[PDB]
Structure formats: structure tokens, C-alpha cells
Amino acid sequence: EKVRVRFAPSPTGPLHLGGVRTALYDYLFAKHNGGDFILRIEDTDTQRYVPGSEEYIMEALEWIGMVPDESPKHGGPYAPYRQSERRDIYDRYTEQILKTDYAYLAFDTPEELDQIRAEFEARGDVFAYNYETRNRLRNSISLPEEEVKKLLEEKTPYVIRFKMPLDRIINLNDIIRGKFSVNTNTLDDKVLVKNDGMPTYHFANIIDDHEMKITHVIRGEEWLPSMALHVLLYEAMGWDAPEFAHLSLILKPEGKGKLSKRDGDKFGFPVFPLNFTDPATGNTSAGYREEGYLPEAFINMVAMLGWSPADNKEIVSMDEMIKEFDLNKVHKAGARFSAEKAKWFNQQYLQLMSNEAILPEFKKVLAENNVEVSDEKALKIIGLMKERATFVKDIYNDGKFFFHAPESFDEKASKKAAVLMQELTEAISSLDFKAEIIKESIHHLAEAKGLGMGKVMMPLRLSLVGELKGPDVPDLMEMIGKEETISRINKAIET
Ligand SMILES: [Mg+2]
């Protein structure tokens, strides 16, 4: 009855958005049902290993707040949680499946397989090792029993392949995709065990899902064409298969096709949760985290790529998502990635942070730009700016007038927006430079003279900013102070 799910990334590079979503739905499904979330490292393909990938995965899950219950770091009752460390388990089950009619030995070399691939290509076809071709290749079905015996005495390298049944209809049932049927004649005699005795992912994963008592396999639709094989492997072993749920690939923001790093490089959004430096080129892809996406906003955005809670509430915490996540409500249709939505989520979460919660990152941005201000002023600037910001860095980049005087003045704004009025304003501001009192003084000057408030406010804004932007003028004057306010006014008068 206890739900057990597993996230099974390979240590072959960084997590993509699809992988983050799979991990999230694993976590939400396990926690919603009071079950267990397992991390199993799929490191049997030694030649695709990227140093630091396991550490990357753990750091990303920790950043988002989805720590596995069982993992290499935490241990657990079914350790080892790295597949490279489970060879004795795999050997036991390799011996078992070789007693069935579902597996056979194959001796074909890479050159021999390249040769038949070229023969098919010349006919405009694609080679598949399957029922149709296995009898003309070199394996324990096609070769005389005496030749196989001879080859094994000679220590000839061999793989173990699954023996696809002849003309059998497999009826599959997926939680996301529903019921469908597949004829085994469309499927291949996939390799189960490599030359060195280690399983391929197909065989390792069904062995370990069985051993680790996994109840629900949640994964991407890239695995869906292999589902029939996996169900047949459980049958071959005399085992009950878990339930499956196949998530449709995330779609491109615009046009046909699936989301790829090409879309991130062409549209300007990140593709990995954390910084990843490619070892081949030394170039670093900046992650969501380092680009300033708040983890609560990031994971809220990822959750909604194909799941819509019944209450139509878009902003939800991890605890709220745990309470209402229903795997049967995840859409079969692909969901388009939206950079707009990701930025909107970030803005929504940023606006609700306290000024104090924003201050550490804001001070980091200031330091990177060689700017220093008191914490008192920094908190006030954050309060004045955060409602319009999408990222904390925007509070500086769009508020440079808090720290730097204008050197020029926009001509269009200069034309739209006299020195006597400004001189008279300079005399009146010599008081308690508070925004509420400054505005009261400006209204007193406007009422004393014969002009509407904009006749004072607009040229004043131009003087302080160089263009017509920024927060309310009396707030800006309070932030930069009396001396700097008058300095900028006199500079604008002289210009
Ligand atoms: Mg369903």
C-alpha cells in the first residue's frame, strides 16, 4: 500500500527542465500519499559519465526543497542507490532470465552490425535486430549449438538480448496516456546485458524497481516506446510490474517541436536549474538560480507545465501542491514552455518578499557595481522599487538615479518639460527632507504660484533622473538627500 517512487537520472550532465518536472511530480505524488521518494543514480554507462553530475542533482534538489528519503547521500534499506555498485544483484537476475525463453546470447561485433546497417540504408530502410533479422546474424538462436559452445570456450565476447515474441499483442495501460496496444513485431531484441556483464538501463531499471519495491514509475515519454519491453521483462522474471505514468515532452515556446537549449539560447532564458560548465568547451550555462529566479517561483512554474489544480489557483506553495497534487489530473497533451510565465511567477513571489528578505541579494548586486549605501536607505529603495521588479537586480539596474547623478538629459523629455521656479523650489526645500513634507512643500509652492503640480514635478523629475522615469519625485529626493537634490537641480539649470 505504501507508495514508492524514484527519480532515476543518469550522471551524464545537468538536469533539464523536463527532469526537474519529473522529480517534482515524483516528490508531490509520494508526499501526497505519505510515501517514499528515492533517488537512484543511473551510472552504469561509464563512458557517458560527467564528473560532478550526482553532486549537481543533489544540489538542485536541495535548492528546490525536494530531498530524497533514500539516496546515496542518505542511505536507505535498499542500498546501494548507485547502479554501478549493484553488479552482484544484476548477476543473480542475469542467471535467472537466461533460464527462460525470453533471452539469448549474441556475438555480433560492431563491424558486423555496421555492415547490416549499411545494407538496410542502401535499400532506404533502417536495420532493427528483431524476429525478422535474428536468424541471419550471429547469436544462440541462429548458430548451431556446437558453434555456440565453441565460441564460449574461446571466451568470445557476447551480449544478452531480449527475445521479442512472434506476433504478440501487448495491452498497455498508462496513468497519463491511457490504454493502448502494441504488436511485438514492431519491437526489437534489445540488449539487456553488455559485453562486460553490466545491464543496460532497460534491464537494470526493472531489476531495481522490483528490488526497491517501487509502486509507480513516473517518467518522460521518451521511454514510452520501451514500455512494452519493460512489461515483458517483468513477465519474464515472474514479477508484477509497477504502474507507469509517461509525461509528455515540454513543447517549444513558439512553433512546432519540443523545448531545447536552442530555444533558451535564441530567446534568452536559462535551461538548467544551476550553473553548468561544459567540460569539453569550458563554457558555462547560467542556471535559473544564478539568473535570480526564486526557487519557490521556479518550482511553481515547473509544476504548472501540464498540471492545473482543480481550484484554478496559480500561486501555490510546496505544501499546497503536496496537498492537492493528483497524478490523474496531469495532462496528456504537451505543455508549451513560457518565458513570460516564468518571469511573471518570479515577479509575483518577489513582490511578496519582505524588504529585509531582499536586502542580502540587493547588497550583493550593489557591491558588484561598486556602490555602497546604508542599510536604512537600501531597505527604503527596495520598498519603492520591488513592485515593478522581476528580479532583485532590476532594483539597481532600473534605479541607477538613486546612486548616480544624470550626466545628460533626454531631448524629448527636455522639450516636454523654467529656472526661476526651480530656484524658488531650492530655497523652500531647506527643511526636514521627508517625502511627505517635501511633497507638502511642493504643493505649497504650486498653490502659492499659479501652476499645476506637474509644472514643478516634471522638470524636477528630469533634473534628478535625466529622463521621465523613476518613483515619485519626493521619494527620490528623500533618498538622494538635500545636498544631492540641489546639486542635480543646479546642474539641470546650468544645462
Ligand atoms: Mg489516466
Numbering used by the authors: 2 to 418, 424 to 501
Sentences from the paper on this structure:
Glutamyl-tRNA synthetase (GluRS) is essential for tRNA aminoacylation and is under investigation as a bacterial drug target. GluRS catalyzes tRNA aminoacylation: the binding of glutamate to tRNA. The structures of Elizabethkingia GluRSs reported here share ∼97% sequence identity. EmGluRS and EaGluRS are monomeric enzymes that assemble with a prototypical GluRS topology with an N-terminal tRNA synthetase class I (E and Q) catalytic domain and a C-terminal anticodon-binding domain.
EmGluRS was co-crystallized with glutamate, while EaGluRS is an apo structure. E. anopheles was initially isolated from Anopheles mosquitoes and causes respiratory-tract illnesses in adults and neonatal meningitis in premature infants, with a notable outbreak in 2016 in Wisconsin. The EmGluRS and EaGluRS structures are very similar and have a root-mean-squared difference of ∼1.3 Å for the alignment of all main-chain Cα atoms. Intriguingly, the glutamate-binding cavity has been probed to develop promising inhibitors for Pseudomonas aeruginosa GluRS. PaGluRS has a similar structural topology to EaGluRS and EmGluRS.
